[PDB]
Amino acid sequence: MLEDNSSTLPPYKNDLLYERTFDEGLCYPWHTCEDSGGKCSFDVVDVPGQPGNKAFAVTVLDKGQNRWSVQMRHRGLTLEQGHTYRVRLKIWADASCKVYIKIGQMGEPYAEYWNNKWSPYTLTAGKVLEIDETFVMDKPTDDTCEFTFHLGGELAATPPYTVYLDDVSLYDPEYTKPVEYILPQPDVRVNQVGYLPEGKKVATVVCNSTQPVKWQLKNAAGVVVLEGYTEPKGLDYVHWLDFSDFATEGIGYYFELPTVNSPTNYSHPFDIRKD
Numbered sequence: 485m486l487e488d489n490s491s492t493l494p495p496y497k498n499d500l501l502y503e504r505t506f507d508e509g510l511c512y513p514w515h516t517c518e519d520s521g522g523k524c525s526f527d528v529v530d531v532p533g534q535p536g537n538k539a540f541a542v543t544v545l546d547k548g549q550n551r552w553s554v555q556m557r558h559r560g561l562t563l564e565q566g567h568t569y570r571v572r573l574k575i576w577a578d579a580s581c582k583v584y585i586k587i588g589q590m591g592e593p594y595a596e597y598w599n600n601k602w603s604p605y606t607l608t609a610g611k612v613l614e615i616d617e618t619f620v621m622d623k624p625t626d627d628t629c630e631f632t633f634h635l636g637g638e639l640a641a642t643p644p645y646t647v648y649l650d651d652v653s654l655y656d657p658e659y660t661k662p663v664e665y666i667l668p669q670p671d672v673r674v675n676q677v678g679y680l681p682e683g684k685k686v687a688t689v690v691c692n693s694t695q696p697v698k699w700q701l702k703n704a705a706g707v708v709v710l711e712g713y714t715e716p717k718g719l720d721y722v723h724w725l726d727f728s729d730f731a732t733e734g735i736g737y738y739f740e741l742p743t744v745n746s747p748t749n750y751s752h753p754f755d756i757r758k759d
């Protein structure tokens with residue numbers, strides 16, 4: 485499920501970005517680009533001092549010739565004329581360096597629609613830069629935009645070092661992500677392929693009760709391997725089911741809500757595994 489249930493960002497459905505938190509250990513569609521001598525590598529890693537939180541981590545390896553020689557970006561975005569966008573992120577580095585952040589066209593003529601008025605930011609070693617601001621898309625609608633961070637050339641410290649990105653968001657109240665319609669879902673909603681052992685794992689539960697409800701994780705053989713109570717969130721009634729510490733690989737896990745008087749009181753099957 486693409487929904488991230490971030491407890492501090494605006495609604496996922498109104499975000500132009502598809503990955504914001506990285507807490508499940510995945511970064512796609514975020515990716516690097518290496519150009520004109522630039523080299524880098526990437527991973528998703530835990531953040532020291534922030535338990536449960538993971539960050540997109542791009543290691544600069546060769547600065548290359550230009551600032552765009554090393555990039556981390558998210559493509560496929562449409563900025564709409566007359567709309568107001570809110571830009572939020574946390575970025576830091578384990579070497580003092582600089583970064584040029586922009587939202588613009590991915591190809592020629594490379595129009596830039598937000599770019600901190602053409603100014604790079606400075607990332608002092610270990611010090612977090614947090615951005616939270618708005619801009620108006622007053623140019624005509626463009627469907628070739630990317631949210632990108634240029635790290636190369638003159639912006640770069642002496643490699644190697646790593647730049648981290650987290651809770652990155654592009655919010656427009658008048659935008660709703662494209663949708664597929666889905667069949668009525670069972671009461672427990674999971675990621676239908678699954679989770680990495682080390683990733684955050686929060687399922688969504690809908691049920692009649694306003695109060696917490698008993699849940700059991702069973703393996704494929706139907707044996708209970710973990711139990712808890714849900715955490716009620718709001719309106720039937722939406723609850724969260726956090727099983728992040730469970731890390732045991734297997735195929736065909738599923739939940740059941742044993743006390744819930746519902747013929748759909750389970751989840752679909754899913755896997756925990758490294759793939």
Ligand SMILES: OC[C@H]1O[C@@H](O[C@H]2[C@H](O)[C@@H](O)[C@H](O)O[C@@H]2CO)[C@H](O)[C@@H](O)[C@@H]1O
Nearest residue numbers: 517518519552555588589590591594632
């Ligand atoms: O074509 C090489 C490379 O271009 C990258 O875009 C750069 C471009 O090279 C540069 O002329 C312009 O001023 O900056 C942009 C980036 O904002 C592009 O990002 C790569 O995908 C492409 O392979």
Ligand SMILES: O=C([O-])C(=O)[O-]
Nearest residue numbers: 564658659660661662
């Ligand atoms: O903003 C829009 O037009 C939309 O939701 O596609």
Ligand SMILES: [Mg+2]
Nearest residue numbers: 486488502503
């Ligand atoms: Mg995600």
Ligand SMILES: [Mg+2]
Nearest residue numbers: 505506507538
């Ligand atoms: Mg995170």
Ligand code: NI
Nearest residue numbers: 564566567658
């Ligand atoms: Ni509009």
